[PDB]
A paper describes a structure:
At the molecular level, IMP1 regulates the transport, translation and stability of a diverse ensemble of messenger RNAs (mRNAs). IMP1 function relies on the recognition of a diverse set of mRNA targets that is mediated by the combinatorial action of multiple RNA-binding domains.
The structure shows that the KH1 and KH2 domains fold into an intra-molecular pseudo-dimer,, an arrangement found in a number of KH and RRM-containing proteins including the IMP1 KH3KH4 di-domain. Within the pseudo-dimer, the domains make contact through the two β1 strands, the inter-domain linker and the C-terminal α-helix of each domain (α3), burying a surface of ∼1200 Å2. Interestingly, many of the amino acids mediating the contacts between the two α3 helices (S254, C257, H265) are conserved in KH1KH2 across species but are very different in KH3KH4. In addition, KH1 α3 is longer than KH3 α3 and the linker between KH1 and KH2 is three amino acids shorter than that between KH3 and KH4, implying that the shorter KH1KH2 linker must span a longer distance to reach the amino-terminus of the second KH domain. In KH1KH2, after a sharp downward turn, the linker assumes a nearly linear conformation retracing the direction of the helix to reach the amino-terminal residue of KH2. The differences in the inter-domain interface result in a change in the angle between the two domains and, as a consequence, in a shorter distance (7–8Å) between the two RNA-binding grooves, as highlighted by the superimposition of the two structures. The structure also shows that the path between the RNA-binding grooves of KH1 and KH2 is positively charged, which may impact on the dynamics of RNA looping as discussed in our model below. A plot of the RDCs measured in solution against those back-calculated from the structure reveals the high correlation (R2 = 0.97) between the two datasets, indicating that the crystal structure is highly representative of the protein conformation in solution.
Residue numbers in the entry: 191 to 236, 239 to 362
């Protein structure tokens, strides 16, 4: 399909970034070629964490999310650092109402359908120019990725519903 406008944005531990890029960038270029995605790495304004942006199709983003998670787990095990590495997703505060639903029922439903635990950063931790919440997903890799697919479906729909009026008028 067409690459979509809203990227998947992950927050990963800085110490695993070198592993994701790999020698002479061959790991990231491999992920890019297998998933047909544009990937970049940058700071998140609000030290031990870095932002990863994946611009792909929905399926390309989900596949890159799984490859990235597998590398981080490989690297956490291989350095005896951790046996789990939670998946952290960045989503604009405007979209997270829809994902959460009334009294968090939509989020419990994703947690139950995917066999994951999900927690969302506090509203009070946003900044004037950083409107992104962090959604922490814990569980097996395959399960975190199913939750990624569900969350990012909801975020993309909320984005397309919010901008539909202003796209028509032009």
């Amino acid at each position: 399909g067409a690459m979509v406008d809203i990227p998947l944005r992950l927050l990963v531990p800085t110490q695993y970034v070198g592993a994701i890029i790999g020698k002479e960038g061959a790991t990231i270029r491999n992920i890019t070629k297998q998933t047909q995605s544009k990937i970049d790495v940058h700071r998140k304004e609000n030290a031990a964490e870095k932002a990863i942006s994946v611009h792909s199709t929905p399926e390309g983003c989900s596949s890159a999310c799984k490859m990235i998670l597998e590398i981080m787990h490989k690297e956490a095990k291989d350095t005896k650092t951790a046996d789990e590495v939670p998946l952290k997703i960045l989503a604009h505060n405007n979209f997270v109402g829809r994902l959460i639903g009334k009294e968090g029922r939509n989020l419990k439903k994703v947690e139950q359908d995917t066999e994951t635990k999900i927690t969302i950063s506090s509203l009070q931790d946003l900044t004037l120019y950083n409107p992104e919440r962090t959604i922490t997903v814990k569980g097996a890799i395959e399960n975190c990725c199913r939750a990624e697919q569900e969350i990012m479906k909801k975020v993309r729909e909320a984005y397309e519903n919010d901008v539909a009026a202003m796209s028509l008028q032009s």
